[PDB]
Amino acid sequence: LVAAYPIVGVGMEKLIISTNEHASTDQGKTVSRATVQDSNGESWNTGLSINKGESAYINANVRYYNTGTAPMYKVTPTTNLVLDGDTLSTIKAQENQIGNNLSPGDTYPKKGLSPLALNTMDQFSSRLIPINYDQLKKLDAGKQIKLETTQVSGNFGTKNSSGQIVTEGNSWSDYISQIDSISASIILDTENESYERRVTAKNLQ
Amino acid sequence: LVAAYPIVGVGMEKLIISTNEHASTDQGKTVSRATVQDSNGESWNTGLSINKGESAYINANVRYYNTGTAPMYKVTPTTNLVLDGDTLSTIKAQENQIGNNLSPGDTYPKKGLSPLALNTMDQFSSRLIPINYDQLKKLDAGKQIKLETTQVSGNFGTKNSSGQIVTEGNSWSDYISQIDSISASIILDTENESYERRVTAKNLQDPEDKTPELTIGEAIEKAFGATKKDGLLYFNDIPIDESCVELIFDDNTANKIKDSLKTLSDKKIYNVKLERGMNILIKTPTYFTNFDDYNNYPSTWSNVNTTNQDGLQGSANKLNGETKIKIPMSELKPYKRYVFSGYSKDPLTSNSIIVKIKAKEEKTDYLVPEQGYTKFSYEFETTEKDSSNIEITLIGSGT
Structure with missing residues (x-):
């Protein structure tokens, strides 16, 4: 009567910006001689510029954590960056920011x-995320x-007749809402600590 | 009762930066003639610039190593670069930094x-990793x-009915956590060297399962191949006793053993009966x-007496005198927190001169x-490389 339903949370640690x-x-250095007159000059050139359009890159520090009664294999979250009553970007993590295993608790x-x-922000790890x-x-x-x-995306394992288990195509997404329509x-x-459980109910209608 | 579970570690060798x-x-060179007047000038232009945004590239030197009881085919780790209480990047290695084979040990x-x-940092080997x-x-x-x-990602091999083995889709990831929920x-x-093993346990809560459980001494004898020699345990003629090694528990494990010891009689x-979640x-x-x-x-002690010198529980001399051994720091590694531990006896007074500099020269x-x-x-x-020695001295009146 209790269903395996792992909860994933993302926690903020630190934010670094970069210009x-x-x-x-x-x-x-110039010199000149002329026939009698001469000249000798020394010139400096300091230079500072900034071009908007990819003007401020950033990076974020995160850590994943589980809560519930299931493992979560090959987890991948998505994040939504707000600044001031607004949004900045939405990122599904790439291959490098994947999480392999997440035991419950x-x-x-x-x-x-x-x-x-x-x-x-790109699918392959290029093009660092800019802020205007x-x-x-x-x-x-x-x-x-x-x-x-x-949202997150992960996989569960199930054993076949061969005795070992497999994790391929067994998504956790297509058992989210079904559980969320039968349970409290x-x-x-x-x-x-904190614990989130789903307990099955009975429709009286 | 011991499960194949290979541990991978990454070791730092050197770091190179580049600007x-x-x-x-x-x-x-300019010249000019005018009608009578002339001019001739020679000008130089040195130039140096730097534009932030991909301003410092780096490269790292690594080497992989195994520990455990399994091979690991087609290994791929991931790394997380810190600088100063922070992070810089996180890299899963590309095709060029893959590792094919990794035998255990x-x-x-x-x-x-x-x-x-x-x-x-890119998926294909371009765009060298920058530091601002x-x-x-x-x-x-x-x-x-x-x-x-x-984390790492690798594959195992298994033979089919055709006689040869295959490595495709047989990931090691989906047997990580399962093992880490049944084992100590x-x-x-x-x-x-160092060795990390996972030994299966028995849940005492739910009784429908029949897992053959054992104790921690039997767990050490079963995990490693340990020869029971005359009651003692020996691993490659190395003695491993309850009194001849140094054990380390974390606070949950130490607390569990400490409560389960008082109901025990020995x-x-x-x-002690093995439990489920332990780090020992x-x-x-x-x-x-x-x-x-x-x-x-290197040197042998003073005022020794050979009456039942068996180790623990039988040390059988209670007299007066002194023991002393001096050892210089050249034989041992510098800048490391050494721990000195022994046992007790029945004297009435005894004191220990541990005179090592840069350290606890308190003698109690x-x-x-x-x-x-x-x-x-x-x-x-x-301390650092001194013939100025640590001289352990034990003065006793009653042992």
Whole structure:
């Protein structure tokens, strides 16, 4: 009467920004002789430029954690970056930000480790995620961002007649809403942990 | 009852950085004639520039190694680069940084070789991994980085009816957590190697399952191939007793053993019933003092007496005197927190001179509880390459 239904959450650790700024320094020395007169000049050239359109790159620190009564193989979340009552981007994680295993009642990575990075928006890990100039002015003026869990995608394992189990095509998505139409969601919160369970019900209609 | 479960580790060797800097040098020569006047000028143009956004490329030197009881075909790790309480990037290795084979108890590449490079972040080997300017200033200001193992992906082989084996789709990931929910993690650490094993357990909560359970001493005898020699356990003629090694428990495991010990009748931590979720470290000692035999010591002690020198539980001399051994720091590794641990006796007063510099030169009296045998242990810090020695001295009146 209790169904396996793992809950995934994403936690924010730190945010790093970076500017795409352009500097230069030149020194020139000229001399001239003419017939009697001469000249000798020394010139400097400092240079600083910035071109909007990919003007501020960022990276975020995350860590995944489980809650519930199931493992979650090959997990992949998606995130939605807000800044100030708005949105900035929406990212499904690439191959490098995948999570292999997630035991119920555990975090990814393990507890004696450091968090995880994400910095690119393309499908293959290129083209670091940019922020335009007005959001940079909102950021340095005093406003801060947060993170947001939207959906995940993972797999379960099931044993065949051969004795071992397989994880291919056995998505967890197509048992989400079905469970969420038959069950009540009961959550417990203690002083250190939290637990989310789905308990089956009976339609009286 | 022991499951194939290979552990992969990534080791840092060297880090190389590189700057995306831009230089130029121009020379110009002009002449002019006018009607009578002339001119002739020679001009130089030095130029140096740097544009942030892909301003510092890097590359890292790694080597893979196995530990456990399984091969790992077509291994692929992922790495997570920290700099200073932060992160820089996370890389799953491309096709060029793959590892084909990894025998258990071995490294990739083989031992008579050089390490491996990684320099790009894209899926196809382009777009070398950049570091922006502030991290470069943190780096050249004095701060350094390290590496971090996060996950791996590999394959196992299984034979069909055709007689040969195949490695396709047989991932090791979907047998990770299942094993990690049925087993206790027991790790051994000797002076050169380390071994991580998973031993199956029995859930005492639900009784419909019939898993043949055992105790922790039998678990060590079954996990490694341990020869029961005369009651003791021996691994490659190395003694592993409850009194001859150093055990390490984490607080949940230590608390579970500590509550389950009082309902037990015997004061031995090899006879405790194994439980489900445990992390148990065992470590060998460097220098052992069985006064009968097997004493890897440069000099031998003073005021010795050979009456039932059997190790524990039979040490049978209670007299006066002194023991002393001096050992310089040249034989041992510097800058490491060494731990010195022994047992008790029935004297009335005894004190221990541990005179090692850069460390705890506090010397205390024994405070003997009774004639029963309990342990005692101190910690200290190793100095750097001194013939100025650590001189252990035990003065006793009653032993």
